[PDB]
Symmetry: C3
Subunit: 231 residues, 3 copies
């Protein structure tokens, strides 16, 4: 484990995702509202999945070597197995908050799968220049997601209860800022141009992951928007 300088950030990430999972699990014990139960189930699964994948990276299972640039490059593939399941769950939290229609939910989840799937292909591609073709396709899929979150959901939240509109607006802004950083870290990190070393890259993804999952969840599950209007 300790033979890799980035191990400290993988261990911290593992701990923070595990602690986040347990807090949400305990906090959700005393909840019977069927609407609130939906948000607790979605939001608790997110850091639980991330916990297992951070642990796999810490123990060395989620790491492979990819030859490109005449070098064997360490690629943590477990990140994409994490994101494949956690990013659509996070979008479902937002879509259920605004009572989005089914067709829009399917478009979001499908574009998200394309985003993560093409990012994985780009991470494992051995022809250096082709890695950035996949990065560009994946980034186009992300821009579609961000467009929908702004010019489809925002207008839908305003016609909703005030507390669900204000909570959505906050979580929307958090998501757009944090998610946009991921393609940048990829491009300048060891998967892309190799400007930033792997140990610093790992620290950046850990800060982003914890903020986008645990921080996101703390804002959502403390809001009254997750409960139905009741007397």
């Amino acid at each position: 484990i300790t033979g890799r300088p980035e191990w400290i950030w993988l261990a911290l990430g593992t701990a923070l995702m595990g602690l986040g999972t347990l807090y949400f699990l305990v906090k959700g014990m005393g909840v019977s509202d069927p609407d609130a139960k939906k948000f607790y189930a979605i939001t608790t699964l997110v850091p639980a999945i991330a916990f297992t994948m951070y642990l796999s990276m810490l123990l060395g299972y989620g790491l492979t070597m990819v030859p490109f640039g005449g070098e064997q490059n360490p690629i943590y593939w477990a990140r994409y197995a994490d994101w494949l399941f956690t990013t659509p769950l996070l979008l479902l939290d937002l879509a259920l908050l605004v009572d989005a229609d089914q067709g829009t939910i399917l478009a979001l989840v499908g574009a998200d799968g394309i985003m993560i799937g093409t990012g994985l292909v780009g991470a494992l591609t051995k022809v250096y220049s082709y890695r950035f073709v996949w990065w560009a396709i994946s980034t186009a899929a992300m821009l579609y997601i961000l467009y929908v979150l702004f010019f489809g959901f925002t207008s839908k939240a305003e016609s909703m209860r005030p507390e669900v509109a204000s909570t959505f607006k906050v979580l929307r802004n958090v998501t757009v800022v944090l998610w946009s950083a991921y393609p940048v870290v990829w491009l300048i990190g060891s998967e892309g141009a190799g400007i930033v070393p792997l140990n610093i890259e790992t620290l950046l993804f850990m800060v982003l992951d914890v903020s986008a999952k645990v921080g996101f969840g703390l804002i959502l599950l403390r809001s009254r928007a997750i409960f139905g209007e009741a007397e």
Copy 2:
């Protein structure tokens, strides 16, 4: 790229799926009917997924070598990753058109997963004679799907609006004819008996894919069956 004679058909397929995706995306911009939005989302995702997998084959990522018959045989595995997601989406288009019940939808999607999954196992199997055992199981799963589309959905469409009944009947006939060709191309192509060479096999799958996805989508999204009855 150009070192493979089949590259021209992979490049054409990539272009036609990309163009198809963009047309459906633009055409769906001016749509607010929640029913129509469902069909546009399903139908636009189909060629978008196929685009990415054709590109992976063009660039050489979606290709592996499988030893059988005393030879290293080029097997494009990316086809099955495509079909795993696009064939159930196409069946969902048909099932939603006739307002199929949930139990029937689950049976269709499950049989479809078995069809594609066993076809993938057959494509990667190293014992030559066993490849055709998997082909037979996969073909049995397809025949179940075709039976349901005829002796379960057809009777349901007649009790529906006339425009949804006539549109379903057309898309049903297109699907049964085109899908039935796939097991035949597999059997006589490089995955099976090896009668037809890979470059011709690739041309045939490209014609079938574009027809079953883009051609299918053009018929559906030009129909009024996708809109609810409104004044």
Copy 3:
């Protein structure tokens, strides 16, 4: 095939899953109740999936070698591909029986995915002591599932029709007893401590699989709880 002593139990399992699939398929022909169709579709898919994965193990495709303990250990990875899809389908049978809320269904299916996913990682892990870390995480996920089936569903079934309450109680008890045996067989078998040899381990999993899928299905599909109350 016959070069492996466990082949006899893989062949028996294949036959019993295939026969089970055909019986459920025939029995479900004469069913039009939309509620009953749901249970028949879920319950017939379970042994059909298991059939294909037992066949892959029989023919040698679903087997790999994992080095640990200074030895190349035969690991049947196809079991986890089976369980990944069949265990959530079995939980869906139970959840639909008691009309569970959506949030609870998602929590069950998500915990089940974590259970199977971490068990697969543990089966393929090359550092011997780490294999049991994954076993423990997977077992914690199972205990969560069992808790929900007892202290969330049981109370919900009592407020239901008497026949659905008594049928659920029976299937609940069958599930908790049979599922609990799996982590024990893993721990003492070739994936874990290696006390029980592989051929005996394979026999035990076959008895458990057939009972948990075909036996489970025979109890459910003979009950009147799967039909709506009708005159």
